[PDB]
Design a protein around this nucleic acid. Structure first.
Ligand SMILES: Nc1ncnc2c1ncn2[C@@H]1O[C@H](COP(=O)(O)OP(=O)(O)OP(=O)(O)O)[C@@H](O)[C@H]1O
Ligand SMILES: [Mn+2]
Length: 184
RNA sequence: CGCCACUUCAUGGAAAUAAAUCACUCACGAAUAG
């Protein structure tokens, strides 16, 4: 209710325009194992257009780099932290928008982290394309809101705040606990 | 006009030179874990 997508395979092959949730529910009609198996064999006999990247799952984890250091650097130049809050919130909203646009799934947070469950390739768009768009969105929000900090601390020299990225691509099997720890 | 032969029996040069020296495809696939 306060929110408004499961298994591991449905968002690995969200490109065929095929609704595995509906057919899996029809077949099954405790829960997770049976529907997991149903989705598995449904896209097993969807072999006609199934490429090897349709069975691989990409986990994307990102965190903000030196946020406290950026805060301390803005403190020297008399720059409010409200601008940083603005940039982070706008980046998070745009991140959710473009992650659902790409074909993946946002899971974790709209803070300075992001854990996304995305297919390797949907509509000819990579997970690396998704990472590039996320980085560009974060840079755009930083520049748009911290413009004062941008043209005040970057002329002489400084690295601007950025986000480091962690991507893990594994089979739909090979459970996602180990994959999550590998991503971490 | 008559008569009649002896000689000489491979040397020098080139003796391999360039091109290609691996190429493409497959570099794990399923099952068992979740
Ligand atoms: N809306 C916001 N505005 C400003 N700062 C924020 C906001 N939300 C979170 N933060 C900051 O995020 C920080 C948490 O960042 P985190 O600890 O993940 O990374 P870091 O220590 O900056 O980076 P790294 O590990 O790369 O050195 C907190 O110190 C907090 O001040
Ligand atoms: Mn963080």
């Amino acid at each position: 209710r306060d929110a408004f997508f499961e298994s591991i395979l449905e968002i690995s092959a969200s490109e065929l325009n095929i609704n595995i949730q509906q057919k899996a529910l029809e077949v099954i009609t405790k829960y997770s194992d049976q529907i997991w198996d149903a989705e598995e064999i449904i896209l097993n006999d969807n072999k006609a257009q199934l490429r090897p990247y349709h069975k691989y799952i990409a986990i994307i984890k990102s965190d903000g780099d030196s946020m406290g250091e950026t805060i301390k650097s803005m403190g020297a130049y008399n720059i409010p932290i409200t601008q940083l809050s603005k940039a982070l919130l706008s980046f998070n909203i745009e991140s959710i928008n473009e992650i659902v646009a790409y074909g993946g799934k946002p899971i974790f947070i709209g803070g300075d982290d992001l854990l996304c469950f995305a297919p390797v390739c949907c509509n000819g768009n990579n997970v690396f394309n998704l990472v590039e768009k996320l980085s560009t969105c974060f840079d755009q929000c930083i520049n748009q809101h911290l413009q004062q900090y941008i043209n005040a601390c970057s002329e002489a020299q400084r690295p601007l705040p950025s986000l480091s990225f962690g991507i893990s691509i594994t089979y739909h099997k090979y459970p996602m606990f180990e994959a999550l720890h590998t991503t971490d």
